[PDB]
Target: Macrophage migration inhibitory factor
Amino acid sequence: PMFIVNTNVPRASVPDGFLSELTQQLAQATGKPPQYIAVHVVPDQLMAFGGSSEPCALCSLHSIGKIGGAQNRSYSKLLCGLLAERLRISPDRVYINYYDMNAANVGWNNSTFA
Amino acid sequence: PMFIVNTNVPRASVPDGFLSELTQQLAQATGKPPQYIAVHVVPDQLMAFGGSSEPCALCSLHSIGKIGGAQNRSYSKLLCGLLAERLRISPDRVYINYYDMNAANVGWNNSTFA
Amino acid sequence: PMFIVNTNVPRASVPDGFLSELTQQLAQATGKPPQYIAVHVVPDQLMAFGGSSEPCALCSLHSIGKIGGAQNRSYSKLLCGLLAERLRISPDRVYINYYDMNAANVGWNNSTFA
Ligand SMILES: */C(S)=N/c1ccc(-c2c3ccc(=O)cc-3oc3cc(O)ccc23)c(C(=O)O)c1
Ligand SMILES: */C(S)=N/c1ccc(-c2c3ccc(=O)cc-3oc3cc(O)ccc23)c(C(=O)O)c1
Ligand SMILES: O=C(O)c1cc(/N=C\S)ccc1-c1c2ccc(=O)cc-2oc2cc(O)ccc12
Model:
């Protein structure tokens, strides 16, 4: 998986170990080796949700395949829970866009996963 | 809808209240309340368009329906107009990628929309 | 094409002229005029790949056509090669998401490409 979180929460409010925790939790949820997991947290953003710049997040979760999608709900509970507990963002001010990529459309190590 | 603008315009030339302006304009364009509108503006970016570092933008509009058909062109007129008038970016140095999301691929508030 | 690189390598490591280099290399690889190419480099990011904060990147290449099995493999060697040589990022710590955009779904200059 590749998980990206864009948030207006400041850098100082992102706990030490947060990328580690995302990685470990994504490994547990997908059941796939953690060595392939990419995580990206982007704090201090100029963002609003519902016209308010209270804490919010816009996220992306990319997975590689064709039959992917069934775990989206489970991921939403997991990831909203992490953003709430760690970054103090209300789950109702988070969107997570899920993208199931074709292997031929993901590059890695000089080629693609096709 | 979720609207994201990445630009090399500096933060100081982003007007005060610009997030609210985007939200309001999208509320009018959609005919739906501001409540579920998310906006994200990213200034100060290292960008080039056409080999030039004159002001430019790369944008995304994600919507669960409410796009396609003649709506993408209408959005482009609205959103290029706003970026030209407020951020002083030439419309010919803006790209906007439109994404018609499936509700099952959008997470929010611990769940997904379908 | 539109090429975006998100990386934890510092801004201070990005060579002067890297945006121009990416623009020219993309032109020659995709066969598209440099005048239409957008590049966006985002350094200093809070990222991990495989649980490690060693240099890594998450990239996107959007194109209206010119995306496919064989083309993407070639692009991956080219783009990993530039990230390795210029930014010192190992190719096995890079993902590139390729998006074949329909012209109807790309806004530009107050309108869309189709
Ligand atoms: C998150 S995106 N986890 C992840 C990343 C890469 C891979 C993986 C492949 C996925 C899908 C494929 O069709 C082929 C894959 O091949 C490899 C090959 C090597 O060497 C490493 C990883 C992948 C997975 C995965 O499911 O295997 C998961
Ligand atoms: C921008 S992304 N505006 C937005 C976001 C979500 C929703 C909305 C749904 C949209 C599409 C669906 O198929 C189902 C939706 O269900 C809900 C349910 C709840 O509780 C809140 C919002 C949505 C809208 C929308 O206009 O309804 C708009
Ligand atoms: O001509 C192209 O293949 C093209 C390539 C681009 N490169 C990266 S995203 C961007 C845009 C276009 C293009 C473009 C691409 C597809 C299409 O159907 C129509 C197009 O029309 C154009 C008109 C113009 O004045 C300028 C460019 C286009």
Summary: Helices of chain B lie at 18-30, 71-87.
